[PDB]
Each structure stands twice: as structure tokens, then as C-alpha cells.
Amino acid sequence: NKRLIILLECAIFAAVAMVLSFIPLDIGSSFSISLGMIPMYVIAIRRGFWAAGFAGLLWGLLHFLTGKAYILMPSQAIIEYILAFSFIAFSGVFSKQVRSNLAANQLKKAIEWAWGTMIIGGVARYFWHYVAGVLFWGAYAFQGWGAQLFSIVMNGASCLGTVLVSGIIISILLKTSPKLFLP
Amino acid sequence: VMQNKRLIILLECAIFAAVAMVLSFIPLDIGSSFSISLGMIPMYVIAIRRGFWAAGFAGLLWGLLHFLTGKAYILMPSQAIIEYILAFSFIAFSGVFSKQVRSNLAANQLKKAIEWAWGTMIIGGVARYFWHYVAGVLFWGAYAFQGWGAQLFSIVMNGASCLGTVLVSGIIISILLKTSPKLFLP
Ligand SMILES: Cc1ncc(C[n+]2csc(CCOP(=O)(O)OP(=O)(O)O)c2C)c(N)n1
Ligand SMILES: Cc1ncc(C[n+]2csc(CCOP(=O)(O)OP(=O)(O)O)c2C)c(N)n1
Ligand SMILES: CCCCCCCCO[C@@H]1[C@@H](O)[C@H](O)[C@@H](CO)O[C@H]1O
Ligand SMILES: CCCCCCCCO[C@@H]1[C@@H](O)[C@H](O)[C@@H](CO)O[C@H]1O
Ligand SMILES: CCCCCCCCO[C@@H]1[C@@H](O)[C@H](O)[C@@H](CO)O[C@H]1O
Ligand SMILES: CCCCCCCCO[C@@H]1[C@@H](O)[C@H](O)[C@@H](CO)O[C@H]1O
Ligand SMILES: CCCCCCCCO[C@@H]1[C@@H](O)[C@H](O)[C@@H](CO)O[C@H]1O
Ligand SMILES: CCCCCCCCO[C@@H]1[C@@H](O)[C@H](O)[C@@H](CO)O[C@H]1O
Ligand SMILES: CCCCCCCCO[C@@H]1[C@@H](O)[C@H](O)[C@@H](CO)O[C@H]1O
Ligand SMILES: CCCCCCCCO[C@@H]1[C@@H](O)[C@H](O)[C@@H](CO)O[C@H]1O
Ligand SMILES: CCCCCCCCO[C@@H]1[C@@H](O)[C@H](O)[C@@H](CO)O[C@H]1O
Ligand SMILES: CCCCCCCCO[C@@H]1[C@@H](O)[C@H](O)[C@@H](CO)O[C@H]1O
């Protein structure tokens, strides 16, 4: 029953996220808007912290199976497609608050809590992308840029752009489809 | 080779992950739901020595090594994922107070260094055993005592396992801060 259902929902939203990953919003190899965070955000709100991590990791592991995983070195694939996607769990730190306000028709308060949990969950993921950027992606930097500088700026931009476009759509989905976040 | 700081830190993570995997072959278990993980001792050293991200990388390496060495108890593909990848990745939080420990240890403030160390060891331990508790509820409900639900059995057993692990590992680390300060100070 419930155990199978919650696990399946994680797998479904992971699959949807993997599908959205085939929609390229990239500028080079260091900037990209991850539309797959949209299914991650709803499942994080709908089910909570642990579910967002499991679903997130499934999404990361699906990169390997679908061949969408950039692999410079074995270490870097471990950090970027497993560690980083596991910390999507933090997208559900305010899931109870969002669901609480959403069910009580406090949509404004629900959206505000939603942006709080989408930013934390976003930064939590891209932290590991920033780490791997310094360790592995130095040779892709601009002319005269260090590995750390190139990593914080590019991963910061990717994080900023990703949370922004996903946050807006989530906000609309909170307005248009409340039951999607309320199981 | 020793001038490449990035390669060294990665190697150190691999080394401590290997040492933790060896300690995982030391059975301090009572049944299948209680165990004192001695492998958290090297995980705590590297966490203090190198910080948050290194602890998570080393922890995950330790977690993955369970598959290669056949030490992973796999009930379902989804629980193996949660317990040997998610749980071991959250050992990163063993390094939330790494700077404080090293800062006090270098200033010869041993008492304060140990106090921060215990804080960073408790948080890191809880961060890992959270996922063991989650999997305990989701999967390990059939190994419970008679009359015990999945929730009850998981919070008590994983709580005790976490308690026993943090206590034993914490004391060993506390002594190593006294006897071997340079081990935590790169
Ligand atoms: C400076 C820098 N450049 C490039 C990378 C590589 N990188 C950034 S995000 C990422 C994860 C995949 O990104 P994306 O194309 O958004 O995958 P999605 O989640 O959308 O499926 C990787 C491998 C990095 N970690 N750091
Ligand atoms: C109630 C419950 N019982 C059993 C488990 C299974 N379990 C607990 S901790 C753990 C990780 C391995 O722990 P340990 O036995 O200490 O191995 P080691 O740390 O030495 O590698 C697993 C698979 C669980 N998650 N929940
Ligand atoms: C279509 C999307 C509209 C934008 C929605 C986000 C604007 C609301 O912004 C709120 C703040 O007003 C509030 O003070 C803090 C509290 O921590 O959290 C934010 O989400
Ligand atoms: C959202 C963030 C956008 C950041 C864009 C930064 C553009 C970098 O632009 C760099 C310069 O900084 C550098 O000095 C010269 C050297 O030949 O080459 C360029 O590519
Ligand atoms: C669509 C782009 C805008 C939505 C994102 C805004 C992020 C939340 O920003 C809020 C602020 O609005 C607020 O003033 C302070 C006060 O504690 O805390 C922040 O979290
Ligand atoms: C204060 C006591 C801490 C816990 C001690 C754990 C004892 C470890 O020793 C156990 C044995 O007690 C057990 O019989 C076999 C097989 O089940 O495996 C061993 O690991
Ligand atoms: C002394 C430290 C705390 C341990 C107290 C209880 C240990 C026994 O707990 C066992 C479990 O470990 C075992 O997996 C299941 C199997 O069905 O049955 C229980 O009796
Ligand atoms: C050999 C075993 C030594 C055990 C030493 C335990 C020290 C506990 O350390 C605590 C800290 O964890 C706590 O945060 C602060 C708060 O003010 O106070 C200390 O006593
Ligand atoms: C083996 C001994 C382990 C000791 C670990 C202690 C960790 C908790 O540390 C607590 C603090 O968190 C608390 O603020 C103060 C207040 O009185 O007291 C300490 O014992
Ligand atoms: C050893 C570490 C123990 C951690 C226990 C976590 C305490 C919170 O417990 C809640 C549960 O009560 C709840 O069923 C779900 C979320 O709705 O998961 C946890 O977050
Ligand atoms: C920290 C160590 C905790 C160990 C707890 C062990 C609980 C024992 O479990 C008993 C069962 O063995 C007994 O058969 C039934 C009776 O119907 O009730 C339980 O309390
Ligand atoms: C690893 C876990 C170690 C066991 C718990 C350590 C106890 C610290 O907990 C302290 C107590 O010692 C203190 O008496 C009161 C404050 O009035 O509450 C806590 O702050």
C-alpha cells in the first residue's frame, strides 16, 4: 500500500525529471537550466525530505543508464551524479509548512514557504557541483580564470537560473493544481 | 605529487574509506538491527581533517565498497540504495564543525576542540542513521519484536545503534585528539 505508493511516486517523478533532462537549456558545459528540478520540487513538497532524496538519487542514477552523464573521471561522476542529486532531499525541509498553508487556502504563505525550500534544496545540490567544478572542471574555464572562480560563478548562475524558472512554475502549480502537492 | 592538494584530498578520502571498510569486517552486531559501526572512526578523522565535502565523498566511497566486498545486506534494490548510498553520503555532516575543531586543536585548546568534535560527531551520526531509520520503517518491519510496529522498532534500534556508534567512535576520537593532534591537522 502506502510504502509501495510513496516509493513509486519517487520513481515516477524521477523518470519525469530524467525526461525533462533531454530538453537542452545549456550554454557551454558549465551553464545549464535543470528543468528536472520541477518534478523534484513537487515530490519534495508532496512527500517530504527523505522522499526527495530517494527520488533525487534515482534521477541521478538514471543519467548513467540513459547516457546523459558527463564522465571526466570516476570520482567526479560519484560526486556529481550521486552526491549532488542526493542532496535534493533538502528541497523538502519546509514541505509540512507548504502543505499546511496550501490546505488552509493560505496560498501566499504556501508559495513563500515553497521558495524557501526550493532555494535551500537548490543550493544543497549545486554545492556539490561547485565542489566538483573546482576539482575537475578547471580546464573548461574562461581565459585567465581559476578553477574556484570559474566554478562558483558558473554553478552559481546555473543554480540561480534553475531555481528561478522552477520556482515560478511551482508557484503557478500551487495555484492551479493544489491537490498535486496534497496526497 | 604531494604538491597537488586536490589529488591528495581525494586519496585521503579513499584511504579512510578503505580503513572504515576494513573495520566493517569487525562484527559488533546483536542481531540484524543492532550494530556498533567502528568504521565511523576513520570517517570522523577525515571529516575533521578535510571538512564537509570530503566526509561525504569518503563516506559514499565507504558505502559503495559494501557492494564490492559483498558486505551489503540487500533486501530490495530500493533499500540498498537508501542504506548504502544515501545514508553513507550524509556522513558529510560529520564535518559541519571541522574548522572549529582544527582551530582549537592548533591553538592547543584541547578541551574546546573535543567539545566541538563531539558536536560534529553527533550531528554526522544522526545524519546517517536518519536514513537507516527511514529504511527501517519502510523495509525492516518484519524483523521487529512481537507487538512492535515498523516505526517503533526502527526508531529504537537505529537510535541505539547510532548511540552506541557515536559513543564508541567519539571516545576514540577524543583520545586521538590528545595523542595524535597532527592527524587532524594537515
Ligand atoms: C564549473 C563547472 N562546470 C561544469 C560542471 C559539470 N556539471 C554541472 S551541473 C552537472 C549536473 C548535470 O547538469 P545538467 O545538464 O543541468 O543535468 P540535469 O540535472 O538538468 O539533468 C554537471 C555534470 C561542474 N560541476 N562545474
Ligand atoms: C530497524 C532496522 N534494522 C536493520 C537495518 C539495516 N541496517 C542498519 S544500519 C545498516 C548499515 C550497516 O550498518 P553496520 O551493520 O554497522 O555495517 P558497517 O557500518 O560496519 O559497515 C543497515 C543495512 C535498518 N536499516 N533498520
Ligand atoms: C510567480 C511567482 C511569484 C514570486 C513568489 C515569491 C515572492 C515572495 O517572497 C517571500 C518573501 O516575501 C518572504 O519575506 C520570505 C520569507 O522568508 O519568503 C519569500 O518567499
Ligand atoms: C551569470 C554569470 C555570467 C558571467 C560571464 C563571465 C564572462 C567571462 O569573460 C572572460 C573574461 O573575464 C576574461 O578576462 C577574458 C580573457 O580573455 O575572456 C572572457 O571569456
Ligand atoms: C521570482 C523571483 C523572486 C522570488 C524569490 C525570493 C526569495 C526570498 O527572499 C526573502 C526576502 O523576500 C525577504 O525579504 C527576506 C526576509 O527574511 O528573506 C528572503 O528569504
Ligand atoms: C555494551 C555492549 C555493546 C554491544 C556488544 C556487541 C557484541 C558483539 O558480539 C556479537 C555476539 O554477541 C554475537 O553472539 C555474534 C552473533 O550474533 O556476533 C557478534 O558480533
Ligand atoms: C545491548 C544493545 C541493544 C540491543 C537490544 C536488543 C537486541 C536484539 O534485537 C534483535 C534484532 O537485532 C534482530 O534483528 C531481530 C530479528 O528478528 O530480533 C531482535 O531480537
Ligand atoms: C574521553 C571522553 C571525553 C568526553 C568529553 C565530552 C565534552 C562535551 O562537549 C560539550 C559540547 O558538545 C557542547 O556543545 C558544549 C556546550 O556549551 O559543552 C561541552 O561540554
Ligand atoms: C561520552 C561523553 C559524551 C558527551 C557529549 C555531550 C554532547 C552534548 O552537549 C551538551 C550541550 O549540548 C548542552 O548545551 C550543555 C548544557 O548543559 O551540556 C552539554 O553536555
Ligand atoms: C538515529 C536517527 C533518528 C531520526 C528520526 C527522525 C525523527 C522524525 O520522524 C519523522 C517521522 O515521524 C515521519 O513519519 C517521517 C516524515 O513524515 O520521517 C521522520 O522525519
Ligand atoms: C536500548 C535497548 C532496547 C532493547 C529493547 C528490547 C525489547 C524487548 O521486546 C519485548 C519482547 O521480547 C516481548 O516478547 C514482548 C512481549 O509481548 O514485548 C517486548 O517488549
Ligand atoms: C552521544 C550522546 C551522549 C549522551 C548525552 C549527554 C548529555 C548532555 O546533555 C545535557 C545534560 O548533561 C544537562 O544536564 C542538561 C542541561 O540542564 O541537558 C543537556 O544539555
The rounded distance, in Å, linking the Cα atoms of A173 and A181 is 9
Overall number of domains in chain B: 1
Closest-CA distance of chain B to residue A50, Å: 8
Among all bound ligands, the one having the nearest atom to the CA of B153 is 2
The rounded distance, in Å, linking the Cα atoms of B57 and A82 is 10
Residues of B in contact with A83 (CB under 8 A): 56-57, 60, 89
Report CA(A89)–ligand 5 centroid distance (Å): 21
- Phi, psi of B36, rounded to the nearest 5 degrees: -95, 105
Max Cα–Cα distance, chain B, nearest Å? 60
Give this entry's resolution in angstroms.
Answer: 3.0
The contacts found for B164-169 with CB under 8 angstroms, 24 or more apart, are B164/B34, B164/B36, B165/B35, B165/B36, B165/B37, B165/B40, B165/B125, B165/B129, B166/B40, B166/B121, B166/B122, B166/B125, B168/B36, B168/B38, B169/B37, B169/B38, B169/B40, B169/B41, B169/B44, B169/B121, B169/B125
Identify residue A74 by its one-letter amino acid code. P
Residues in chain B: 186
Using CB atoms, pick whichever of A61, A78, A127 lies closest to residue B60.
Answer: A78
Q: Ligand 5 test: best mutation among A97, A108, A115, most atoms within 8 Å of CB? A: A115
The stretches of chain A forming alpha helices (DSSP H) are 2-20, 37-47, 49-66, 74-78, 84-86, 95-103, 107-136, 147-176
The domain containing residue A140 runs over which residues? Answer: 1-183
Q: How far is CA A55 from CA A51, A147, B124, in A?
A: 6, 31, 22
Q: For residue A45, what is the domain's CATH number?
A: 1.10.1760.20
Report CA(A172)–ligand 6 centroid distance (Å): 55
